[PDB]
Design a protein around this ligand. Structure first.
Ligand SMILES: Nc1ncnc2c1ncn2[C@@H]1O[C@H](COP(=O)(O)OP(=O)(O)O)[C@@H](O)[C@H]1O
Ligand SMILES: [Mg+2]
Lengths: 308, 516
DNA sequence: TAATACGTTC
RNA sequence: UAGUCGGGUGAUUAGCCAGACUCUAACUUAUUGAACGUAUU
């Protein structure tokens, strides 16, 4: 059935879809991307044919996603995520380890079985094909280990779905004690105006993760961080200032000003100019008031010339 | 790349170093300045612009600890608790982490030490593995250097990998920059309870046995005598000319010729020696160590080598009296050895500092009061931070006398009822610095000022209760106990004075009651 | 058995 | 006291000026993939 649906969407024969899917878990290109500091990140991206199938799958099958899930959601972004916590004085950030690669076919099917919201039902015969569509085989010789890949188009949707029940439970728990909760992919953020309420959250998380996923999904204890108005609060790279407003942060603002000054004196190359324009667009999205100030500081003409 | 250039120009050390490695003089200079820049404060002490210290430690299913989080002070942290609370376990965890820095400063891709699969995993851990997670700080350019040591129990199917690359990356910066141009290097040392148990010198000998085997008296004495003999009694060309002139003259000048030949050889060696191993003169080294010992060690004001008797003897001025070092207590010897060893390593690793003891580093000391008389317990920590102002000290103690000299912010205490589940260590509620010993015993160490197991400790309480039972008058029973108190503690005892006070007050209270 | 308009986040 | 927040000034990622905050307590991250902003059309 899944095959027939995909074939219809992609205007291909059932046979050619089925044939393609036999080796689909191995049709991933692996490459490295430089980290901002030292080292490289490893990415596994599906082949074109497989990407098309994955997109078709996601189109055909609507999977439930909790409202607290901010990543990969239409109309929700890093701004919305940060804004959810801006009004609260105390902040807790928690992180899940190897988030995508921890999600296995077993977890996926468990989530389908557990799910109370209107989950698609799949025929047993289709289960094998679905696994081949959604999960990558990292070790060529070990056919038994399929995992979600970081760079697949379907992985965001599947990951959000797998966290649906988790999000439901923790959201309910947080609501009772006036904690704001949002999830951006593997990043969990908690904020409150009540002192000491956030101290219990890590323990609650460990129990819940164990209950739902056993040992498959775990907290990164090194990346669990407490913050307050006494210290720097950031959520998904956005600074929350002491006036409870979103900010780019002082250093980023100063850097943009530096680049504007360089542009003013024709010292910025085309690449740096393009970079500056991107930074200003981002600044406009996160902190529009900053753009207003820059316009006042710099000659509207200069800024318009720059945005051309 | 342009991104790395931006971050590097923003002051990020790792990005600057990556640009240096790919390419070049500008980036090198930026890295070198990050490490070497500092200032002299109002007190005349050199302060690095970019400090290096351990910020936080987390222990998961390690030995007794299910999950433990510790925030450390930049200068001094003292960990206190009963036997078996895991104080030594904490220091061992840190020392293993520090071994990864040392290994990689010495050699590219050097391997540090590892957690034991037999002993280090908590015995009743469901998930049969242990983690030691540490975060280090190195100035505002490198606010976080995370390292994790992990080990899975023996015969477990899935092995858990340690994450050590950030340690290696930072250690690589130190190693590579030092190779091109000499820099000052961080000191790492552990002094455990085993300190008490009874080639030419080269800069990176300072890292040899630094995290176990350090601080041994015999090594010091031998070294000190050696330095003395060399420092008893100019250009190479000038020295070469002097040696040549003296050789031509050569019988009474033969001793002088041999001395000058030695000086020439040493000068050539120093000339031939590499930038990565640049070192201060033996005379200077000797002087710094002597000053360190005399500054730090209680009641030693002077130290020197005598050879007048015909054997090489180290002598000290102890409490104003000149004595042989063998006439010191074992407590004082062990402490002298610790300070001498530390000073020796600091001198070797900080050749560019005016005062090499103002170098950076992390030093761990287990049971600092080991073998010390109460008198010297009252002095030991006062000295250490003044002599080594930029070292992060992490120490353990049992001593209330030691705690009386330390601020409460530096203290981390275990709860006495902690069965290993506890999440965070915290400071005591009472201020310890300048406080009475008896108060620290009761308020911080949870011990009565009088031994509860001794009957005589309860006599005053019992005496008071007898007085109150007989409307304040001294009856046959109260008199007997009074006599027992007098007989046991003595006529001039504080206990008898208290009893006398009770009698006087109660007599007067009763008289008032009768005047109804 | 990856893609290239520029930024941001995971 | 120290750290943090950032309005102004500065051929400007620096330095300097002003105001504010303080649960034991941020460490600014990752693309070509996904989402969001901007540009092209
Ligand atoms: N693997 C282990 N599992 C459980 N408890 C352990 C383990 N290893 C050591 N312990 C416990 O740790 C304590 C000793 O830790 P230690 O650091 O020596 O304490 P101290 O503070 O006295 O120096 C004892 O209570 C011992 O029973
Ligand atoms: Mg992109």
């Amino acid at each position: 059935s899944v095959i027939r649906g995909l074939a219809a969407v992609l205007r291909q024969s059932d046979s050619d879809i089925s044939a393609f899917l036999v080796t689909a878990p191995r049709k991933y290109k692996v490459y490295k991307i430089p980290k901002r500091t030292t080292g490289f990140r490893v990415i596994a991206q599906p082949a074109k044919g497989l990407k098309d199938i994955q997109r078709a799958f996601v189109q055909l099958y609507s999977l439930p996603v909790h409202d607290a899930s901010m990543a990969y959601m239409k109309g929700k972004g890093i701004r919305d995520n940060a804004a959810a916590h801006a009004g609260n004085q105390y902040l807790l950030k928690a992180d899940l380890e190897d988030f995508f690669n921890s999600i296995t076919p077993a977890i996926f099917w468990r989530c389908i079985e557990m799910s109370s919201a209107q989950t698609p039902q799949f025929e047993p015969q289709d289960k094998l094909f679905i696994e081949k569509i959604l999960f990558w085989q990292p070790i060529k010789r070990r056919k038994t280990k399929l995992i979600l890949s970081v760079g697949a188009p379907s992985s965001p949707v599947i990951s959000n779905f797998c966290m649906y029940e988790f999000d439901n439970r923790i959201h309910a728990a947080c609501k009772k004690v006036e904690i704001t909760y949002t999830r951006y992919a593997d990043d969990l953020t908690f904020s409150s105006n009540i002192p000491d309420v956030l101290k219990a959250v890590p323990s609650t998380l460990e129990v819940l993760l164990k209950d739902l996923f056993g040992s498959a999904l775990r907290l990164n204890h090194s990346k669990t961080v407490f913050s307050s108005k006494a210290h720097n609060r950031h959520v998904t790279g956005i600074t929350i200032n002491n006036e409870e407003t979103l900010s780019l942060g002082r250093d980023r603002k100063r850097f943009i000003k530096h680049l504007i000054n360089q542009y003013k004196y024709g010292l910025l190359d085309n690449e740096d100019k393009a970079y500056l324009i991107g930074l200003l667009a981002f600044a406009s999205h996160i902190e529009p008031s900053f753009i207003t100030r820059m316009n006042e500081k710099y000659s509207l003409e200069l800024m318009e010339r720059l945005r051309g | 790349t342009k991104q790395y250039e931006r971050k590097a120009k923003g002051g990020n050390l790792l990005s600057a170093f990556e640009l240096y490695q790919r390419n070049v003089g500008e980036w090198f200079e930026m890295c070198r300045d990050y490490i070497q820049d500092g200032h002299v404060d109002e007190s005349g002490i050199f302060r690095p612009d970019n400090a290096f210290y351990l910020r936080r430690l987390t222990l998961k299913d390690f030995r007794r600890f299910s999950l433990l989080e510790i925030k450390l002070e930049e200068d001094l942290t003292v960990i206190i608790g009963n036997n078996g609370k895991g104080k030594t376990s904490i220091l061992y965890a840190i020392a293993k982490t520090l071994s990864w820095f040392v290994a990689n400063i010495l050699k590219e891709g050097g391997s540090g030490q590892r957690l034991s699969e037999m002993t280090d995993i908590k015995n009743d851990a469901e998930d049969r593995y242990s983690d030691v997670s540490s975060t280090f700080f190195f100035g505002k350019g490198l606010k976080s250097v995370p390292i994790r040591l992990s080990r899975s129990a023996l015969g477990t199917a899935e092995r858990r990998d340690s994450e050590v690359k950030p340690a290696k990356d930072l250690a690589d910066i130190w190693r590579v920059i030092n190779e091109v141009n000499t820099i000052n290097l961080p000191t790492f040392a552990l002094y455990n309870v085993e300190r008490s148990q009874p080639r030419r010198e080269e800069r990176f000998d300072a890292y040899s046995q630094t995290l176990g085997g350090a601080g041994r008296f015999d090594h010091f004495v031998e070294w000190y005598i050696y330095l003395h003999k060399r420092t008893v009694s100019s250009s190479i060309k000038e020295l070469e000319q002097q040696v040549n002139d003296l050789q031509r003259t050569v019988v009474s000048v033969k001793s002088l010729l041999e001395q000058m030949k030695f000086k020439l050889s040493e000068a050539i060696e120093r000339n031939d020696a590499a930038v990565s191993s640049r070192v201060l003169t033996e005379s200077v080294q000797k002087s710094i160590v002597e000053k360190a010992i005399c500054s730090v060690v209680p009641s030693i004001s002077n130290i020197w080598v005598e050879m007048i008797t015909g054997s090489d003897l180290v002598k000290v001025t102890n409490d104003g009296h000149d004595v042989t070092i063998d006439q010191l207590s074992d407590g004082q010897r062990v402490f002298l050895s610790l300070v001498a060893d530390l000073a020796r390593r600091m001198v070797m690793l900080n050749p560019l500092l005016e005062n090499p003891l103002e170098g950076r580093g992390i030093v761990l000391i287990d049971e600092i009061e080991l073998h010390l008389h109460p008198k010297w317990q009252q002095e030991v920590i006062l000295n250490l931070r003044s002599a080594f102002p930029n070292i992060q000290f992490i120490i353990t103690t049992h001593s209330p006398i030691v705690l009386s000299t330390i601020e409460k912010r530096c203290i981390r205490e275990f709860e006495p009822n902690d069965d290993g589940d506890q999440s965070f260590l915290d400071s005591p509620d009472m201020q310890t610095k300048g406080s009475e010993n008896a108060q620290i015993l009761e308020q911080v160490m949870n011990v009565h000022s009088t031994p509860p197991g001794i009957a005589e400790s309860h006599w005053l309480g019992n005496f008071e209760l007898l007085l109150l039972d007989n409307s304040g008058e001294l009856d046959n029973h109260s008199q007997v106990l009074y006599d027992q108190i007098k007989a046991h503690f003595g006529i001039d005892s504080i206990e008898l004075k208290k009893a006398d006070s009770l009698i006087r007050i109660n007599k007067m209270k009763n008289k008032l009651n009768k005047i109804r």
